[PDB]
Ligand binder design. Structure first.
Ligand SMILES: O=C(Nc1cc(Nc2c(Cl)cnc3c2OCO3)ccn1)C1CC1
Length: 301
C-alpha cells in the first residue's frame, strides 16, 4: 500500500490556515509538517498540490514539498500535503519572540526576496518553470529555518503564467488573500487580472510590508521596536476591505518608517526598499530580482 501518509504519525496540532489544518508528524522518525484538508476542501488541496509539483520549483527559499496523498481512517478520507518541518515556525511567530541583528535582518529579507524572485522567474527549457505569483504573501506564510533563512509557503492561491500564449492558468477572483496585505489596486478592484505582471507587482507590495515587520525587530545598541503587524496603528485587528481601502487608497498612508532607521546603513537600505514597494502604481515598484540584488550587495558590504 501507500508509502507516505500511511506511515506518518501526527504528534501536535500547529494551527489552522485559510483552508485545512497544519500538524507536526513523524515519518520514519523524522519530523515533517502536514497540512490536512477534508473531502469538501479537495479543490484547495489539489490546487496547492498542483502548484508545489510545478517543474523546477524547488528552491532553498520555498517550503520543501514532500508529497500530496490520501489517508482513509476507516470513516472518512483526509487529503494530505506533506512538507519539511521547521522548528521556528512562521516569521510572524519568530519576530514576535525575538529581536534580530543587522546580519539576521538581512538574512531574513534577502532569503524572502530570493524565494519570491524564484517564484516570479520564468525558467525556459524542456523542464521549464512558469512564472508564479503568490497572492497571499505575509509573515504568517513564511517559515524561518534553523539557519536563520526564510522559505515561502501557502501556495494555494498562486497563479501561473504561460508566457508564450500569454495566459494565466486559472480564472482568478478579486481579493482572495489577507486583507491587511492587499495592495492598493487589489483593495479597490482596479487590478487588471488578465495582466500577469499585476499579480507580481501586488506580491512586491506585500513583501515590502513583511520587510517593515522584520526591520522593527532589528536591535542595535539595545534599541528596537515592539512587534507589530503593518497598519497596527491605523486599522482594527481583522480589518475589512473598506477599512483598508480608506487608509491605503484614500488617505494614502503606509507603515511608519522610524527616524532611528536612517542612522544605520542596513536599515536605510531596507527603508528605501519598502518605499519603492509601496507606490500605489504597481508599475513603479521594484522587482523581486532587483531587491535580491540590492540585499545581496548589502550583505557583502
Ligand atoms: O509550525 C512549525 N513549523 C512548521 C510550520 C509549517 N507550516 C505550514 C504552512 Cl505555514 C503552510 N503550508 C504548510 C505548512 O506545513 C505543511 O504545509 C511548515 C513547516 N514547519 C513549528 C512551530 C512548531
Amino acid at each position: 500500500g501507500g508509502t507516505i501518509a500511511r506511515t506518518i504519525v501526527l504528534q501536535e496540532s500547529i494551527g489552522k490556515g485559510r483552508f485545512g489544518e497544519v500538524w507536526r508528524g513523524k515519518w520514519r522518525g523524522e519530523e515533517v509538517a502536514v497540512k490536512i484538508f477534508s473531502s469538501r476542501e479537495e479543490r484547495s488541496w489539489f490546487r496547492e498540490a498542483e502548484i508545489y509539483q510545478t517543474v523546477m520549483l524547488r528552491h532553498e527559499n520555498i517550503l520543501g514539498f514532500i508529497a500530496a496523498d490520501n489517508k482513509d481512517n476507516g470513516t472518512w478520507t483526509q487529503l494530505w500535503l506533506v512538507s519539511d518541518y521547521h522548528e521556528h515556525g512562521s516569521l510572524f511567530d519568530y519576530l514576535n519572540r525575538y529581536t534580530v541583528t543587522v546580519e539576521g535582518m538581512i538574512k531574513l529579507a534577502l532569503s524572502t526576496a530570493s524565494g519570491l524572485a524564484h517564484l516570479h522567474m520564468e525558467i525556459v527549457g524542456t523542464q521549464g518553470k512558469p512564472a508564479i505569483a503568490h497572492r497571499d504573501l505575509k509573515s504568517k506564510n513564511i517559515l524561518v529555518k534553523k539557519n536563520g533563512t526564510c522559505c515561502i509557503a501557502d501556495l494555494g492561491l498562486a497563479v501561473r503564467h504561460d508566457s508564450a500564449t500569454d495566459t494565466i492558468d486559472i480564472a482568478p477572483n478579486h481579493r482572495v488573500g489577507t486583507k491587511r496585505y492587499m495592495a492598493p489596486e487589489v483593495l479597490d478592484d482596479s487590478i487588471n487580472m488578465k495582466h500577469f505582471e499585476s499579480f507580481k507587482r501586488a506580491d512586491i507590495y506585500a513583501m515590502g510590508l513583511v520587510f517593515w515587520e522584520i526591520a522593527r525587530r532589528c536591535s542595535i545598541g539595545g534599541i528596537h521596536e515592539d512587534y507589530q503587524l503593518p497598519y497596527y496603528d491605523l486599522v482594527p485587528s481583522d480589518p475589512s476591505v473598506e477599512e483598508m481601502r480608506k487608509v491605503v487608497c484614500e488617505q494614502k498612508l503606509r507603515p511608519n518608517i522610524p527616524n532611528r532607521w536612517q542612522s544605520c546603513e542596513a536599515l536605510r537600505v531596507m527603508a528605501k526598499i519598502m518605499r519603492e514597494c509601496w507606490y500605489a502604481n504597481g508599475a513603479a515598484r521594484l522587482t523581486a530580482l532587483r531587491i535580491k540584488k540590492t540585499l545581496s550587495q548589502l550583505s557583502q558590504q
